[model samples]
Target chain A: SIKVCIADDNRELVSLLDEYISSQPDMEVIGTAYNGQDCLQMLEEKRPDILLLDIIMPHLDGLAVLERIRAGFEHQPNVIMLTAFGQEDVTKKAVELGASYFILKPFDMENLAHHIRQVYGKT
Target chain B: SIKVCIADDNRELVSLLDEYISSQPDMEVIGTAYNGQDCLQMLEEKRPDILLLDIIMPHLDGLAVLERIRAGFEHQPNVIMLTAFGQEDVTKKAVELGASYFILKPFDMENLAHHIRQVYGKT
Candidate 1:
């Protein structure tokens, strides 16, 4: 099973994604975080196969978290930055910081699942 | 099966929700709109059993759409207002405007599905 973690300030969206990810037979949601700081803390605890990081969040943002992941983590997970409209510059920054891919907001979870499979070669 | 419509500026979340709702055997996502005006226009074309509306959107806000729905629509769908933190005042306004329920941001879709069943007496 592919392990995944989600970090987003919006609780509802995070919960929704958690359920969606959990429902997939080939996947498991390792943990969830509501802010960048908490997300980093979770990362320190367990390194999942994929990290769904939101760009805008309280206490250190997604890019900052990405920076820490690249610099600090011994086993860096594949990062997927979640971005909204008008944040292309920061999205690019996330990619530069070692994010494997970027998924724009309001995206389909099926597509996200597909991305996960592709990342792990489960496809 | 109950028909549902979603209105949110965040396309990713909307798409995610669409997939989730569609996966349910007893539910169908009839339509989705990314802006308030488009939402209103879609409502005019078709009304669903439930409306998952974001509190803020382009062209028109959620409260404005709620107002218009109360004023113009002969058959008003049950409105579930989606709110982020610190938007309690606006969420209250949505309740005042006849929203059936308020779902906070980053909510679990299972909870939302439960709410849907409760609203429609499917439970």
Candidate 2:
């Protein structure tokens, strides 16, 4: 199973995402973090195969974590940027910073699941 | 039967949307225009019940057509703002100018069909 570590502040959305990820045959939600710092700390302890990261979070946003990963992490996992309706610029920036993919929030679960398989199944 | 008209510069995408709209049970694609002026002219000649309009076009874009429709048309049809991924500001402006709904391109057809029902079916 492909392990995924998700980081998002919104509890409801994260929960929904967790359920969706787990339902997929080829994937599993290994862990979830509510904030950026929590995600980074967890990354140090238990690295995941993929990170579905939201851009805005309390204490060290996804960008900061992304920067650190590209700078030093030898086995950096694929990071997919999760964005909302109004955060188009941030999504573009994340794509620029070497993210695996950028998926919009409120996305159709079908399309998202397809993206997950296409991105991770390659590895 | 609700007659629908669409206006966009991109022929391929617009045709795709036309196909989707026609596939709906209660809707029909009455006519399609390639650019803004064509939309306004078509509007004058054949007053559709709903118009799926794009913001950017060669001449007299969606906004301009909207202006003409609101200013004097007797049976002013409901206008839905058809947008791309990066047109949030335009979407807001369209809503302020009295658009019925604002939907993005490459949208989930199911969601968009739902919006169409919510907007036109009620009428």
Candidate 3:
């Protein structure tokens, strides 16, 4: 099973992702964060297999969080960067910073699921 | 080099994809179609290596276009589906009909490029 974590400023999207991921047969939501600091904190505790990390958040931002994680000691989750429209520059930066995959925002749950399986099924 | 054709009702998007993909080093947009009918026609003429097909297209829709293509004789293009926010069911059906990949709409140009390279680079 793929243990997943979500970090986005939108609580509504976080809830939606949590609900959808939990319902999947081989995946479950292990944690969520509304800010990058909280997300970094949760990452250590959760040690999730995949993380849905939004590029924009209250503090630190997803890119900062990602940079810190890669510069770390232990478990590095497969980070899937989430971006809104027109954040192309930062999206490229996220990929360069080692985001495993990316999904543009307002995507269907199935799209997210496909990305998760595509990213995790290799492991 | 990867030869690509785009089939989408959204002219702005088609222009955007065409411009971005054409600018890439290893890929180029060979043709564009504003509807499924024109798409099918262009597919025959272009015989592209990859196709960016939109799901909610007019006159045939992307699933039907995929079916008709799969029910073919020669020159099968690797189709990457372009989906909007809510059309998860059709996205799956397109996959069942042999879509090589799917990307949710309003995505950054970088995201689309990543999908294209990921799908086409293997070939």
Candidate 4:
């Protein structure tokens, strides 16, 4: 089973994602956090296999959280950046910081699940 | 306007795409082809700025099309591979074959339009 953590400030999106990912036979939504700080904190405690991180979060921001994640963990959970248009440069930096993939929103759930499975398989 | 040619076997998808892309303020739907053979031929004549190529088409698969397009042209159109799940390896090879990006289907219209814009801008 792939344990997933969804971290975004969008409560509606997170709720939707939580239901969608949890419904997958092979995936478990370990937790969801509203900001980068809560996200990082949840990850350390919950230890999900993958993290769906939005770049423009309220506290700490995704890039900064990624920097901390990479620095703090020997085996950091695989990350997928959720970005919108014009955030291309930030996505490149996220990849350099060890994000597995950067998915542009509004994405297909099937595609998102496939990314999670693919990243888990690779890692 | 960013000239665009869509090459996909799914006529319904292409029809929807044609209307949507044509409606974009910065884009033009130059043509639509259902197979790689026609796609390549059309590209030679029309020379659209971008090609949305479905990876699994009749006559020539997306991968083969990329190879031929790369081989024949000093300047191949900026390609965005339209792929499905489990086609990860082929997508990587498509990148190696000079594809600009791969958007997993079924994707968002806004996101897809954004991709077309970004790719055109980058080139």
lDDT of 4 by residue, B100-119 (tens): 54455443423422332233
Error of 2 at A26 (Å): 11
Give candidate 2 regions above 4 Å deviation. Answer: A1-123, B105-123
Q: What DockQ was computed for model 4?
A: 0.09
Question: What TM-score fits each model?
Answer: 0.48, 0.46, 0.46, 0.46
Per-residue lDDT value at B99 in model 4: 67
Task: Give the lDDT of residue A100 in candidate 1.
Answer: 47
Each candidate's B-chain TM-score, in sequence, is: 0.80, 0.79, 0.82, 0.80
Clash number by candidate, in order: 12, 0, 0, 0
Poorest 10 consecutive residues of model 2 chain B by lDDT? Answer: B107-116
| Model 3 DockQ, alpha carbons vs. true complex | 0.09
Root mean square deviation (Cα) for candidate 4: 15.3
> Which candidate would rank higher by lDDT, 3 or 4?
3
Real A-B contacts recovered, model 2: 0.02
- A36 Cα displacement, candidate 2 (Å): 30
Give me the displacement of residue B86 in model 4, in angstroms: 35
Segments in model 4 whose C-alpha atoms lie over 4 Å from true places:
A107-123, B1-123
Q: Per-prediction DockQ, in order?
A: 0.07, 0.04, 0.09, 0.09
Q: Best TM-score goes to which candidate?
A: 1
lDDT of 2 by residue, A6-62 (tens): 888888667866876676676677899898878887788767777888886766777
Q: Which residue pairs clash in candidate 3?
A: none
